Amino acid sequence: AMNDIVASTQLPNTIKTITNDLRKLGLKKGMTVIVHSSLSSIGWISGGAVAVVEALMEVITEEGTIIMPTQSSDLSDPKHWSRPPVPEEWWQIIRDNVPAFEPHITPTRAMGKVVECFRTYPNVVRSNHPLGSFAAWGRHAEEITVNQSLSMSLGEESPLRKIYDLDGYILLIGVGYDSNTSVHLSEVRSGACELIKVGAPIIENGERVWKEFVDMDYDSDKFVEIGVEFEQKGTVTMGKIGNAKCRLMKQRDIVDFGTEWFRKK
Amino acid sequence: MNDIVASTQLPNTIKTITNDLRKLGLKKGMTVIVHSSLSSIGWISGGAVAVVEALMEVITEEGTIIMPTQSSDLSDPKHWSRPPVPEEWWQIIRDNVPAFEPHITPTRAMGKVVECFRTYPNVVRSNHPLGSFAAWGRHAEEITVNQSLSMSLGEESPLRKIYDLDGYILLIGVGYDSNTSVHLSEVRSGACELIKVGAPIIENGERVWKEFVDMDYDSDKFVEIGVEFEQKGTVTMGKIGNAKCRLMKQRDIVDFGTEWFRKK
Ligand SMILES: O=c1cc[nH]c(=O)[nH]1
Ligand SMILES: O=c1cc[nH]c(=O)[nH]1
Ligand SMILES: [Cl-]
Ligand SMILES: [Cl-]
Numbered sequence A: 001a002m003n004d005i006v007a008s009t010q011l012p013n014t015i016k017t018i019t020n021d022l023r024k025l026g027l028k029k030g031m032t033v034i035v036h037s038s039l040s041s042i043g044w045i046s047g048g049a050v051a052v053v054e055a056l057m058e059v060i061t062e063e064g065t066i067i068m069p070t071q072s073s074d075l076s077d078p079k080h081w082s083r084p085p086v087p088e089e090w091w092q093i094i095r096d097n098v099p100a101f102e103p104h105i106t107p108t109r110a111m112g113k114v115v116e117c118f119r120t121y122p123n124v125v126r127s128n129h130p131l132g133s134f135a136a137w138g139r140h141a142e143e144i145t146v147n148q149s150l151s152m153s154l155g156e157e158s159p160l161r162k163i164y165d166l167d168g169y170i171l172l173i174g175v176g177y178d179s180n181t182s183v184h185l186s187e188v189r190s191g192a193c194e195l196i197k198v199g200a201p202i203i204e205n206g207e208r209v210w211k212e213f214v215d216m217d218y219d220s221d222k223f224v225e226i227g228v229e230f231e232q233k234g235t236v237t238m239g240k241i242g243n244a245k246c247r248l249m250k251q252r253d254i255v256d257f258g259t260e261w262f263r264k265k
Numbered sequence B: 001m002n003d004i005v006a007s008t009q010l011p012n013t014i015k016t017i018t019n020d021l022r023k024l025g026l027k028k029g030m031t032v033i034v035h036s037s038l039s040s041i042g043w044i045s046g047g048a049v050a051v052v053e054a055l056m057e058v059i060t061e062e063g064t065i066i067m068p069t070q071s072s073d074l075s076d077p078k079h080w081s082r083p084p085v086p087e088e089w090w091q092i093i094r095d096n097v098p099a100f101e102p103h104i105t106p107t108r109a110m111g112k113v114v115e116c117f118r119t120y121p122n123v124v125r126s127n128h129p130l131g132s133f134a135a136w137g138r139h140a141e142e143i144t145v146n147q148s149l150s151m152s153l154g155e156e157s158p159l160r161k162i163y164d165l166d167g168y169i170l171l172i173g174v175g176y177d178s179n180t181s182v183h184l185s186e187v188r189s190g191a192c193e194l195i196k197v198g199a200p201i202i203e204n205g206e207r208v209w210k211e212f213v214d215m216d217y218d219s220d221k222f223v224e225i226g227v228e229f230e231q232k233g234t235v236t237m238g239k240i241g242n243a244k245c246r247l248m249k250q251r252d253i254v255d256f257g258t259e260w261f262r263k264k
């Protein structure tokens, strides 16, 4: 309900107030940052998702880099679907008919309106993976998004590793660690999960192909627990953007912690 | 979503949606303004993309597809009721809401099909900050250029261009209260009054809140008009999956509507 969102807000959030809140929390010009958001968590915003994207770009600038996950699990093999599952009798029709990934076109699923706004901005570029893409904007946009591997999509050949190499930051706006994509790189590095056979529809040599490949069975339901232990160290900056509880942290910090956590089990 | 899946027999796909459109009477070269509810169709392999691609496959670049891309999010808040907001906020809103930019501004209440449509390559969008439309195909640029600020859905609008082209209206799983073309009947009959409105635009480089006048567009009579119109028998009914659909000529409904409003 928009009703509850308006009832819960004292004054409008605007590009200007958001920009203020972001700077207060520690975002600054030139920073490399991957962002995860819930728009409704902030309270009512004048301009909605556009105001958030504009505020982020204002603070970070073209001399910095904004990254967001642009996952499209709508295109994944339906045998592994539980959110919701679909009947087994549909599975093969989906493989034969789900449209192939095209980075300018394919909508995201479960990423949020901010992401949908962001990925269609001018000068925003998207990585090539049919399930596990990211979108970036700014100084290191091209470098972060190019040459993502089909297999091991969130691993050492992915945008996550490039953010790591850039000593980047993670901003969570009113969401928890189950939305912290970067912790998948901890899974890869720790060998935390099983490999499984997955599939996705791609344009390959100029035609739709249902492509089979192997990826880790990524599982964000362990992340919340990792997050609680991580924040005992006291290296996460916490604060508000409007009504939302937000967290700013160094990506290497949580990735390294997650890797050591999985290894010790 | 579990509800959508359970009420679907086999998946809807590009191939099945194209087939349903063609039985419904859509064909190559047509000019059509489309209004839709994605969930109404049942479960779709590829969601909004599948619908958009199906419409394009049938109509082709020789025809033209139009959709409303309204962004009422940017309007003057004094007139809001869905929901309304405290008066204290109104002026703050006017001074801070971001300018309309056709390649960026999201729609409000148009549906995922429109949000997907408006981002497709070769889809062009008109420049009105509240009542823009998006178009694709032969007459896309014709239909979307030179929309007046004032009288946004009037004689200088895409609705009239569709009218001049003798185009069609396709309603997918939605009723006549989503039938944007009937606002032209409102304009023609003088069925609403004028009001003071505003919008944020890019003017000579900068953001500017621009105050203009427009019709108090009210769709509350549209359902009633639609019921009466369909006794004429000039509306094709059909199914796209689970959704009950309607295909009709735009000049038909617009003229009926104009006549309907003038007799009160
Ligand atoms: O319907 C869907 C699509 C993707 N993933 C799911 O779990 N369900
Ligand atoms: O919040 C809003 C925005 C536009 N229109 C409304 O009625 N309410
Ligand atoms: Cl940095
Ligand atoms: Cl290591």
Ligand SMILES: [Cl-]
Binding pocket: A041, A174, A175, A243, A244, A245, A246
């Ligand atoms: Cl919160």
